[PDB]
Design a protein around this ligand. Structure first.
Ligand SMILES: Oc1cc(F)ccc1CNc1ncccc1-c1ccsn1
Lengths: 245, 245
């Protein structure tokens, strides 16, 4: 008796874990610039996901070894009593790679740890990755990076969310944070608890697409528009309705 | 007065054009197999998009020159009096390429012809690409291809729709057609005229993900699951409500 309005089952004891890997500085010999403003992104994300019931776990400037250890740990813990899983990357990236402090890591090996095969307690539950990563470029200045990270599609019941698409530019204010993440966090605040999450992400696409880029303090930053996207492999409507204590 | 329920304006005189490039056979020296069943896909798509008010224009086994001519022609015609644009590729592909009869074409140069800059009459209107393309392997049999075509985004107000994601397999029945396209067309029939189009595509992800692949007539086809995806750069809810005469 197939149902065109089926919602993911979101009535488990806990909402689930939200990992946030936050990268401001890099090993000297990588020659990658500071990401001044990433802490606003981390703090804004932490607050909005907390208010939706996530156990938010933040990690600053982890080396590759440390990051793989923490994310493997979280992948092999039981999610049996959880609604879903959220993982956020705030760093530099290139192609299919995010940068840790130390070295780059294949995104597919991070998403792979949560695929049905390898994490049974999350089968049929939403797995949401959010990626603010672009190319390292070198009071509140707007820095602009070229898109660099492929808009990849993980696997069944994953939702991959991207700051910026091929041929567009990602913006980060050095105090206020990334345009994508400001607008994601504003929409989580107003609508997180009512709207279907892909409906919300679409609002975010509108908000960021509409940010004007014709009258910039830097002449070279003029006409560098920003368009985010999401790659959905979801199989049901996704809501973060308030949980019943 | 920003509106979380904003719909794309779909009250223009015409719905718009749906291009369908349909590829069954290839130049001998490409060493690519027949795609027996692609005609079912073309016919099913043609009927469902027609019933939603599209002027469906189908083209069989075009050479690269011919295909670029037809798609450039359609990109430089006026869409001023149209709701949206749909373009469908049924062929082989690799990376950022679809195969014409003759040779491969960069997908970005096809989507690029409809980007705001280059096709003013479609600015702020949905541009929807649907891609059933995979790797060619050297009565009604189920043929199975490896995913090969990158799940790319395209730009503001584009929706890129993909048969299959990295590490999954695309299925085509030699009479009934592609699993993805059967299930897309079933959902267009039941729900096309009522449901938001990304809601519908999500139903398609459920239908195809749920097709069982443990008890196959071919032993080597066992456990080759199929997961489709979509990459949304849309900025509003998208509906194909019946148009007023
Ligand atoms: O999407 C992009 C974002 C960018 F910033 C830069 C480039 C792309 C296009 N790349 C891909 N997109 C999706 C799946 C695969 C690729 C892939 C893989 C090997 S070369 N491309």
């Amino acid at each position: 008796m197939f149902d065109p309005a089926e919602k993911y089952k979101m009535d488990h004891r806990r909402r689930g874990i939200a990992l946030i890997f936050n990268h401001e500085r890099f090993f000297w010999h990588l020659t990658l610039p500071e990401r001044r403003g990433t802490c606003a992104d981390r703090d804004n994300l932490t607050r909005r996901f907390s208010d939706l019931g996530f156990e938010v776990k933040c990690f600053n400037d982890l080396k590759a070894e440390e990051l793989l250890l923490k994310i493997h740990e979280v992948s092999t813990v039981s999610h049996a009593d959880a609604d879903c899983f959220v993982c956020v990357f705030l760093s530099h990236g290139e192609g299919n790679h995010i940068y840790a402090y130390d070295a780059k890591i294949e995104i597919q090996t991070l998403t792979g740890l949560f695929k049905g095969d390898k994490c049974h307690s999350l089968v049929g539950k939403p797995k949401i990755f959010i990626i603010q990563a672009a190319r390292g470029n070198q009071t509140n200045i707007t820095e602009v990076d070229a898109a660099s990270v492929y808009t990849l599609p993980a696997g069944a019941d994953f939702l991959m969310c991207y700051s910026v698409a091929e041929g567009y530019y990602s913006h980060r204010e050095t105090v206020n944070g990334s345009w994508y993440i400001q607008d994601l966090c504003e929409m989580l605040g107003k609508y997180g608890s009512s709207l279907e999450f892909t409906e919300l992400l679409t609002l975010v696409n509108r908000k960021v697409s509409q940010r004007r880029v014709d009258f910039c303090k830097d002449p070279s930053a003029i006409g560098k528009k920003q368009v985010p996207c999401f790659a959905s492999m979801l199989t049901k409507k996704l809501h973060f309705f308030p949980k019943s204590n």
